[PDB]
Symmetry: C2
Subunit: 234 residues, 2 copies
């Protein structure tokens, strides 16, 4: 948008406080479309806004999907359940596609440092993952594959360029391992990935911190908890 | 759109389960616009949908208003708080105005029994009251006056036609008394209305019935609590 960036950012913050996450996302999409690299604060606002927008549609889709499954002899209740589920699905797809287009058009190509690049490639993986959850047929294999590919690309960059305790690297490992567990139904790959990322970070508990170690240890703990759970479920 | 009434109702119910109240409201608006008197189930769906739609905006408006009064020294910051509040205010106005138009064009004129008519006039009062909360200047006096007028018209019918324990009649007295107290700053009139409604209901306990016993006595208790609070001030 042609609106002042600082005004759009302030509107995003107000929208967040008002719990008007569709407004928050529109403000940050407008900031993105100015075509400058986002600051850390701006990137976080964009990410929170769309998480919450897509989150609301995912929750509605789960509720309506349950109703629609559940055998329905009543012709109008059944047909309206299915049509409404389809309407929510399309809304969700449109949101994810809008994010994916921001990523491909502005965010990934304007990213000039490895950490930002990893952050955005991770987000691409996350939004393909959301699309996967509602996809069917060939489109499902395609979205799953695209999600894996974005997460893998992020991950190789993060291993080459970032410290293993960096919270963005750790957050990627968390999400990627959970992708394997929940989307690909592969607890073995999920464990293998989470274990390596956890062990690599452990090898560098030489952060500083003692004052700020928790920026890393809190996600490390999430990885370690998944590992213990997964190992004690197989 | 091509949906028939049964489809729209089913959609409204699905929308409610999904917490998609804007969709719920749009479905009940379309049902209304078909021009038939609403069933009791339908009238309740419409009321719940719009309560939730408007309630969300009002909640946002209160949040923004509070932030705007903490500060903030900016050319933007106080200015953006005000502009964003104003955006919320126009959204709220558009919702209330849509309801008011449904009420003026379909609901009130198609109502064939007193209880419906009172319900919808009360709602007209309620939605002019919501508009008042964000109005300023001359438009504020106009919305307040319109709220009072609709509540009054409802009240005159209810006293003539409905039992004093009827939950709609009691709910009207509650909302109307609270209007006088909170919006018009007239505690004496507020107390008088609440006290009369409470006293009339209590004199006719045998008109209570199993189906609406709880609904009635809960409102009667609200009226009695306001009365105790107000008289204490």
């Amino acid at each position: 948008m042609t609106m002042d960036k600082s005004e759009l950012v302030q509107k995003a913050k107000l929208a967040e406080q008002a719990e008007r996450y569709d407004d928050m996302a529109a403000a940050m999409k407008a900031v993105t479309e100015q075509g400058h690299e986002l600051s850390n604060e701006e990137r976080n606002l964009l990410s929170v806004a769309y998480k919450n927008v897509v989150g609301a549609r995912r929750s509605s889709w789960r509720v309506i999907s349950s109703i629609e499954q559940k055998t329905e002899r009543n012709e109008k209740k059944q047909q309206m359940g299915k049509e409404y589920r389809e309407k929510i699905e399309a809304e969700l797809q449109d949101i994810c596609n809008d994010v994916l287009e921001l990523l491909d058009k502005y965010l990934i190509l304007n990213a000039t440092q490895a950490e930002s690049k990893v952050f955005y490639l991770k987000m691409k993986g996350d939004y393909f993952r959301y699309l996967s959850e509602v996809a069917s047929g060939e489109n499902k294999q395609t979205t799953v594959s695209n999600s894996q590919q974005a997460y893998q690309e992020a991950f190789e960059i993060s291993k080459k360029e970032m410290q293993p305790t960096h919270p963005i690297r750790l957050g990627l490992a968390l999400n990627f391992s959970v992708f394997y567990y929940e989307i690909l139904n592969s607890p073995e790959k999920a464990c293998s990935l989470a274990k390596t990322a956890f062990d690599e970070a452990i090898a560098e508990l030489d952060t500083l911190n003692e004052e700020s170690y928790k920026d890393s240890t809190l996600i490390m703990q999430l990885l370690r908890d998944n590992l213990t759970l997964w190992t004690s479920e197989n």
